Design a protein around this ligand. Structure first.
Ligand SMILES: COc1cc2c(cc1-c1c(C)noc1C)ncc1nc(C)n([C@H](C)c3ccccc3)c12
Length: 131
């Protein structure tokens, strides 16, 4: 009748046990990298977790075991979840890679992801100096 499957909870975005810092690179990742991607025409499918129930994608979380999205990344930055800039960059990379696993090369959503990823890589090439 209907596929049987719930969404997982979204990724964790805060953790009181983790120490917190602000750094040049983390500030850039929020104010330049995330900001630039978030405002893009094609950001919207990537601004929140994939809702497999609403989108009728019952196999999505059968294969995507490390989901990630820009809404999560934004909250993690805002909550000082990341200590090292590379932890945030890795989350963006996971987001893109997940899209390229679940969706066929050349599909609409993949072309959208590629346009965002190009802009991401350009901004990462201009990452500022560390402390
Ligand atoms: C086809 O892939 C999607 C379509 C989405 C989506 C999320 C995905 C998505 C992403 C991102 N990574 O894997 C999947 C699946 N999130 C919300 C959303 N709302 C609509 C109307 N869509 C449709 C199905 C859509 C299809 C192709 C390109 C853009 C949106 C979507």
């Amino acid at each position: 009748l209907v596929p049987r499957g719930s969404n997982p909870p979204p990724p964790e975005t805060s953790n009181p046990n983790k120490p917190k810092r602000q750094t040049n690179q983390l500030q850039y990742l929020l104010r330049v990298v995330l900001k630039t991607l978030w405002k893009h025409q094609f950001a919207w499918p990537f601004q929140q977790p994939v809702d497999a129930v609403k989108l009728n994608l019952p196999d999505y979380y059968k294969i995507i075991k490390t989901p990630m999205d820009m809404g999560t990344i934004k909250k993690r930055l805002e909550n000082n979840y990341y200590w090292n800039a590379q932890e945030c960059i890795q989350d963006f990379n996971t987001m893109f890679t997940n899209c390229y696993i679940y969706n066929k090369p050349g599909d609409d959503i993949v072309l959208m992801a590629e346009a965002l990823e190009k802009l991401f890589l350009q901004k990462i090439n201009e990452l500022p100096t560390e402390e």
